[PDB]
């Protein structure tokens, strides 16, 4: 539930977003600090979902 | 330009967006000083058969 | 390298404006100090002669 939102740490893995984006099941995709096309081109310290 | 798309992916028509239809079926330049208009066609194009 | 190029133009414009402003400030400062040094050198030449 939204008042107990599920928070997950992601680190130490290959992050390929092509499959995560090419699915048509999504209907709202707003990225703010980074343009989506650059997503497969960077490295990060840690990820939260 | 005229065509017919799945009703879900309308938001992929906007310039600078990405996605399967935008990535490798149809996409617009960086500026695209034109206009876009889309409308429902489930009563004429869609066939119950 | 971290953003798409339909909006990074704004960021570049910010940087250009700031740096040109600072460099213009430096040039004006140098001009004023050069005028003062010119006056001092003219006085020194007269005193010599």
Report yes or no: B21 and B7 within 8 Å, Cβ to Cβ.
no
Enter the tokens of residue C8: 């990074």
Resolution of the determined structure in angstroms stands at 3.5
Report how far Cα A27 is from the mean position of its chain's Cα atoms.
Answer: 15
First to last CA, chain C: 63
Burial of B20-39, coded b for 16+ CB within 10 Å and e otherwise, reads: ebbeeeebeeeeeeeeeeee
Q: What's the rounded Cα separation, in Å, for the pair B24 and C49? A: 83
CB neighbours of residue C22 within 10 Å: 10
CA distance B17 to C45: 70
Which residues of B lie closer than 8 Å to A, measured between beta carbons? Answer: 6, 8-9, 11, 18-20, 23
A34, C1 in Cβ contact below 8 A?
no
Cα separations in angstroms, A34 against A7, A27, A45, B14, C7: 21, 19, 15, 18, 11
Pick from A35, A36, A42 the residue to mutate for testing the C interface (most C CBs within 10 Å): A35
- What is the nearest CA distance from B33 to chain C, expressed in angstroms? 13
Q: Under an 8 A CB cutoff, do A22 and B20 touch?
A: yes
Please name the method used to determine this structure: cryo-EM
Smallest Cα–Cα separation from C3: which of A2, A22, C49, C11? C11
Cβ–Cβ below 8 Å for A24 and B8: yes
């Amino acid at each position: 539930s939204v008042y107990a939102w599920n928070r997950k740490r992601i680190s130490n893995c290959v992050a390929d977003y092509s499959v995560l984006y090419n699915s048509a099941s999504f209907s709202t995709f707003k990225c703010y600090g980074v343009s989506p096309t650059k997503l497969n081109d960077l490295c990060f310290t840690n990820v939260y979902a | 330009d005229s065509f017919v798309i799945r009703g879900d992916e309308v938001r992929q028509i906007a310039p600078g967006q990405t996605g399967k239809i935008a990535d490798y079926n149809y996409k617009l330049p960086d500026d695209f000083t034109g206009c876009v208009i889309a409308w429902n066609s489930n009563n004429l194009d869609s066939k119950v058969g | 390298s971290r953003l798409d190029p339909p909006e990074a133009e704004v960021q570049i414009d910010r940087l250009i404006t700031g740096r040109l402003q600072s460099l213009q400030t430096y040039v004006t400062q140098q001009l004023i100090r050069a005028a003062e040094i010119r006056a001092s050198a003219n006085l020194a030449a007269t005193k010599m002669s």
